[PDB]
Amino acid sequence: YADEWGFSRVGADFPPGSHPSLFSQLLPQALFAFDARAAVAAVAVPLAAMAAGYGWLWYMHSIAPVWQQALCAALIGTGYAGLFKVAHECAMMRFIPQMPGLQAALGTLLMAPALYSLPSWRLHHLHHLLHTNMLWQDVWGWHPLTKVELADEMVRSGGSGGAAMAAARLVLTTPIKLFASVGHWLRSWDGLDLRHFHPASYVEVLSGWAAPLAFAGLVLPAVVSAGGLSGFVSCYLAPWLVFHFWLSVLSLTAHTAPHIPWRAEGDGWDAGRAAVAGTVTLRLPRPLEVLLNNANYMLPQAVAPGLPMWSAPAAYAVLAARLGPYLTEASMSLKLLTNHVTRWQIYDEEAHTYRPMEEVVDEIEADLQQ
């Protein structure tokens, strides 16, 4: 039984030795095309939702109720999450391959409101793709708090207290866990350090950092100059938090479950066993899938990194008809969120048993030093 957590269709077991691009031959070449209508719709529909939300905001600024403001901010954030999915496709060089210059300009312009960098984003996501579900190396992803590290900050820091034993107890036990993409965004700046990067890409990395810096130095002072704090929380900060909620939810539901293990390299980690067996496809209602620009279908993009975004549900239908028992699906519901918040918090590296924080602390607490 694995629908005890809303994980509906669960996967049994995958043989090792396989590479995810291996399954690209299961996808016919009709999906790897350019539909200009689909591209224009994918840019325009979330932009239409954002424009409708902002027109509502200029209609009723402060005379509106809090819940009406929250609903409008949620609509704007979902539209910008769809636009950020478009920018992610542009970063992956698979939105408009005919015009790389327009692709890069569009991706940078659509990632500037998120205070994200296109080259840093594609670098970190290529790192995550090459190190999917691999311990101590992927970083750019929902790397779980292992009981070894909780034990380290549990005994090597003394008792049960500690800075990383209070910050972790605040983040991975509370619904602020569904906003940890803010922490990922803070980590994505790489300390504004060029020494992490190749010396032959310094100008690209600097420009990719400068365009969100141009946004935060030009547009954001114009927002605070046109409404103050009340005109900044409701116009930018709440859509920003909604977009980060969507990014956190998609990233957390992609590669985290009790039946998906995290193994370091040389221990038995494999690319196929981590990609087409370690991915849970989130399923959303069709207006949400259109507004999010099919950002919950990341498995066919993983197995074929040239497959465009609009063909992702069709290619996932092909892959679910072909592979069969190896895939995992999960509908979007309160069950998955409450399980990710209250139950799946600590990953013991012994039987992939995501457990509550206290129950594991109890082990390393009433034992080890005792």
């Binding site: 209609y59 009723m60 600024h61 402060s62 005379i63």
Partner: protein, 204 residues
């Protein structure tokens, strides 16, 4: 007088309206036509109308602002028939201060009349109070009873000494209509008019 002379003499009197951002007019329409400008002499009544607009249509109150306009442009608005402009039915009435309406009723009570009724905006004047300019002697019309009291008390305590100068109150619409339609000796009587603003002899 001519309208230029009336506008020149009505300049030091300010009034307050409620305006949409493109200098429109929050014209409370009530029922069938009956739009009412309600030129407020006091800003508290204008803010009260702002509160009413806020409770009724909250989109309009944020857009609208209290516009200060001198009485010459108000007179220009009042004079022209609105059918010629093509926007008719807007009544453009005057709203007096309630405290000064009460003071006008109290001064009405001195002779003995229906002292719970008044017409128009009250204008106060003491029979014998004159302002000595450079070589001409203007007659101040006081928009405020407190300002008239300060001027009367200061003038009699400065010129020494019985010293109650009648103190009569009329309507501001009629002192404008008489200014417009005066031609004979009434023209020379009104040429010495002087209009004290509602807050001119304050705590200074």
């Amino acid at each position: 007088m001519a309208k230029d002379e009336v506008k020149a003499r009505l300049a030091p009197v300010p009034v307050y309206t409620v305006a949409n951002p493109k200098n429109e007019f929050v014209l409370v329409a009530g029922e069938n036509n009956t739009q009412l400008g309600f030129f407020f002499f006091r800003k508290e009544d204008a803010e009260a109308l702002i509160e009413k607009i806020r409770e009724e249509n909250p989109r309009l109150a944020r857009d609208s602002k209290i516009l200060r306009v001198p009485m010459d442009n108000v007179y220009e608005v009042f004079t022209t028939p609105r059918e010629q402009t093509g926007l008719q039915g807007i009544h453009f009435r005057f709203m007096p201060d309630m405290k000064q309406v009460a003071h006008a009723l109290q001064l009405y009570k001195d002779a003995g009349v229906p002292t719970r009724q008044f017409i128009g905006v009250p204008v106060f004047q003491a029979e014998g109070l004159t302002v000595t300019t450079r070589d001409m002697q203007y007659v101040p019309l006081f928009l405020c009873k407190e300002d008239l009291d300060i001027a009367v008390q200061s003038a009699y305590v400065q010129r020494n000494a019985a010293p109650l100068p009648k103190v009569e109150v009329g309507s501001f619409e009629e002192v404008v209509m008489r200014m417009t339609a005066s031609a004979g000796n009434e023209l020379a009587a009104w040429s010495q008019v002087m209009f004290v603003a509602p807050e001119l002899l304050r705590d200074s």
